[PDB]
């Protein structure tokens, strides 16, 4: 019972907001990431990095504000406030995109903090740490997309910027340049997210529709007691219903809930692997056989070749404003366009 | 009992391995026809003139496609919304050139899936269950309707309905973004909150229940064997799970009521996806995403781009390139 | 030789067989296009 | 079409090896004393 143990005592007091040892990492970093995002989207420009307005102060709305990435010329600079670029000047630092690295890094450490929180509370309460384990998928997504992906590319500039419309742009850029929808790792991601949503929906609805009458109310929520020992719905009825409707059904509850962990977590991990590939332009961009056939045969057309034409449009029409450091000047005559449009 | 009575008793019997029922009476043949036509077409159908400009697009495996590129291709723009069953064609060859399989498949399927929903009600009724699983199913169903029926009605042609294939689906999405800016539409955004959120809560629920499983097994066996089908006891300690989650955030952010919680689990993704469907279904009549193109202007009047304008540039690439030989006049008005 | 006390029987029940085969077959159906390229 | 010639054996082994793994485990499970 020395100072370390007294401190441990205090950190782990059962209060409205639990602190813990992990709280020392988590709360300042989460607070600075959130605060940085709000500061930037409220007051800070992207004129000098992107040639964009991005704050409420400039006239942007909730959908169009962002904390934007730094200029491509900054490369992968940590862009520390006391670093060689800003040199301690807060204003310049904002103008150079310092808030972007500020938010990404404090955010990363805050996520570490939060997952440590999950381990700590699980250990304290006496449960298995499957919540933290599940949270590894958010970590993988954030690290692959905001750290690994730009680190593979020329600079932080091509990371996602922190804003609604900015993220939409990130999506469209990935379609046009990476053909990301074609990527089997993204497809597995989609299957995991849509399948997760499906399981959420179907499990919630099934439980709610195989409830035992445990009260007299027509509103049935009150007919539950957290301390009760009995299942509140019928697994046997649920099992017969889905067996006769869909052909197969869960019969094991433990398996059911593990599966609910497994599907979306695995989905997100796969999507992460794909983005790690896109960091190096290691894309699933083309099917070589498709291209050999289409090059030789001007009547051969599939939805795959149709979509590449769309991609080529996206690249040529978005690049000069989206990539201002490149100083693209694409004369009218070279812009790809179909008839009339 | 007479023959019809016996037949009814069988149809509505609770003891069939797969429930039939009266909805099932419609569902089974329509789904069978949609399935069979779909498989044969996906393997062996010839190229289809989707955009009615005598520019046939190849969808089947035998005609140069793989699993990722292949599709059953939507019917010709020349047909528009006209009903084009097999007996309207002069020949099966004409039928195939004009994308008859698509209409046969999506009509039989939309009917069959509607009856699937009804059948979910019906069996819930036969088994003494509460009835609303079918309402949860209405969300994916509404979505299917949105992309196969409503959007074509609004745009005046089944040629703009979603293709039955993977790459065709991506085609549909990209052209949709070009023509409606769906990303900037709040109903699509609610849809994303719906499925991201559904995924989140799926993982969350799964991990909480798994984390509070009561010890019933040894370390050399699966913990799953600690649950037995139809046991009356709950298999996990919800008070422990609530203690955990409530401490993870704060106490009153957590559900102590399992019914309340599972209702949440059903409502969030279902409502989100309802809005996704309604988003497609209303952009079907060209009420589009937010347009903040050139919304910020400096003191002189110079345009100051925002991220919205960059989006607009991408959309322009999509617009000018899509269906490159189909437009003769400057506005793409459907 | 004296028997090793650390041996344990292994199991795969039928449902796990079906799930596993589904995963393998569907992964193959997904990845095969890319293997053929 | 000019597909990759290793695609066939790749797909075949991708399916067969793990499938066979599972079938082996399943069958030796069934044969254990009930």
């Amino acid at each position: 019972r020395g100072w370390f143990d007294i401190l441990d005592d205090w950190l782990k007091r059962d209060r409205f907001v639990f602190v813990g040892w992990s709280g020392i990492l988590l709360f300042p970093c989460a607070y600075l990431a959130l605060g940085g995002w709000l500061t930037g989207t409220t007051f800070v420009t992207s004129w000098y990095t992107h040639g964009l307005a991005s704050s409420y102060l400039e006239g942007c709305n909730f959908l169009t504000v962002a904390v934007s990435t730094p200029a491509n010329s900054m490369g992968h600079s940590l862009l520390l406030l006391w670093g060689p670029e800003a040199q301690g000047d807060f204003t310049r630092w904002c103008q150079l995109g310092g808030l972007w690295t500020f938010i990404a890094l404090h955010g990363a450490f805050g996520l570490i903090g939060f997952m440590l929180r999950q381990f700590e509370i699980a250990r304290l309460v006496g449960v298995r740490p499957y919540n933290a384990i599940a949270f590894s998928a958010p970590i993988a997504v954030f690290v692959s997309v905001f750290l690994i992906y730009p680190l593979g590319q020329s600079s932080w500039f091509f990371a996602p910027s922190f804003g609604v419309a900015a993220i939409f742009r990130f999506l469209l850029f990935f379609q046009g340049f990476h053909n990301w929808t074609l990527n089997p790792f993204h497809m597995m991601g989609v299957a995991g997210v849509l399948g997760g949503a499906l399981l959420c929906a179907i499990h919630g609805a099934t439980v709610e529709n195989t409830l035992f009458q445990d009260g007299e109310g027509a509103s049935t929520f009150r007919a539950f007691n957290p301390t009760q020992a009995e299942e509140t719905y019928s697994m046997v009825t649920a099992n017969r219903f889905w067996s006769q409707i869909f052909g197969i059904a869960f019969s094991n509850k433990r398996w059911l809930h593990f599966f609910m962990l497994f599907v979306p977590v695995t989905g997100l991990w796969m999507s992460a692997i794909g983005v790690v590939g896109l960091a190096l332009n290691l894309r699933s961009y083309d099917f070589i056989s498709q291209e050999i056939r289409a090059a030789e045969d001007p009547e051969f057309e599939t939805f795959y070749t149709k979509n590449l034409l769309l991609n080529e449009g996206i690249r040529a029409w978005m690049a000069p404003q989206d990539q201002p450091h490149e100083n693209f000047v694409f004369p009218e005559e070279v812009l790809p366009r179909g008839n009339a449009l | 009992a007479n023959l019809w009575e016996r037949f009814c008793n069988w149809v509505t019997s609770t003891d069939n391995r797969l429930y039939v029922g009266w909805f099932g009476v419609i569902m089974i043949p329509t789904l069978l026809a949609a399935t069979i036509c779909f498989v044969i077409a996906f393997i062996a159908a010839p190229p289809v003139d989707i955009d009615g400009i005598r520019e046939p697009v190849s969808g089947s495996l035998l005609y140069g496609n793989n699993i990722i590129t292949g599709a059953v291709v939507p019917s010709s723009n020349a047909i528009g919304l006209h009903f084009y069953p097999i007996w309207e064609a002069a020949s099966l060859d004409e039928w195939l050139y004009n994308g008859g399989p698509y209409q046969l498949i999506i009509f039989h399927f939309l009917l069959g899936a509607s009856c699937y929903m009804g059948r979910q009600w019906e069996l819930s009724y036969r088994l003494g269950m509460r009835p609303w699983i079918c309402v949860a199913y209405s969300a994916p169903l509404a979505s299917a309707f949105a992309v196969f029926l409503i959007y074509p009605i609004g745009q005046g042609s089944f040629s703009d309905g979603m293709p039955l294939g993977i790459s065709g689906t991506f085609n549909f999405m990209i052209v949709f973004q070009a023509e409606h800016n769906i990303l900037m539409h709040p109903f699509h955004q609610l849809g994303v909150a719906g499925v991201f959120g559904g995924a989140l809560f799926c993982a969350m629920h799964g991990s909480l229940v798994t984390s509070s499983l009561i010890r019933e097994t040894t370390e050399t066996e699966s913990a799953n064997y600690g649950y037995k089908f139809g046991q009356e006891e709950e298999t996990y300690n919800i008070v422990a799970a609530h203690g955990y989650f409530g401490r993870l955030i704060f106490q009153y952010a957590s559900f102590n009521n399992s019914r309340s919680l599972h209702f949440f689990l059903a409502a969030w993704p279902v409502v989100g996806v309802w809005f996704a469907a309604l988003g497609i279904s209303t952009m079907a009549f060209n009420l589009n995403g937010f347009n903040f193109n050139h919304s910020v202007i400096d003191a002189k009047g110079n345009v100051i781009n925002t991220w919205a304008d960059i989006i607009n540039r991408a959309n322009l690439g999509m617009e000018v390139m899509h269906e490159r030989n189909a437009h003769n006049f400057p506005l793409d008005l459907a | 030789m004296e028997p090793n006390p650390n041996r344990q029987p292994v199991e795969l029940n039928r449902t796990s067989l079906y799930l596993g085969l589904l995963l393998i077959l569907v992964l193959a159906l997904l990845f095969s296009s890319y293997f053929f390229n | 079409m000019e597909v990759n010639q290793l695609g066939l054996i790749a797909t075949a082994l991708f399916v067969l090896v793990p499938s066979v793994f599972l079938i082996i485990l399943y069958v030796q499970t069934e044969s254990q004393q009930k």
Binding site: - | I67 | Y18, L25 | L8
Partner: peptide
């Protein structure tokens, strides 16, 4: 060969549906 492979995997999956449903291990109440 490609087409044969795609259709073969699909066919195996459909057969798998059949066995998973009609030849599942039956759920048994305890």
């Amino acid at each position: 060969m490609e087409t044969i492979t795609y259709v073969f995997i699909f066919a195996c999956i459909i057969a798998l549906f059949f066995f998973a449903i009609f030849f599942r291990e039956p759920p048994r109440i305890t």
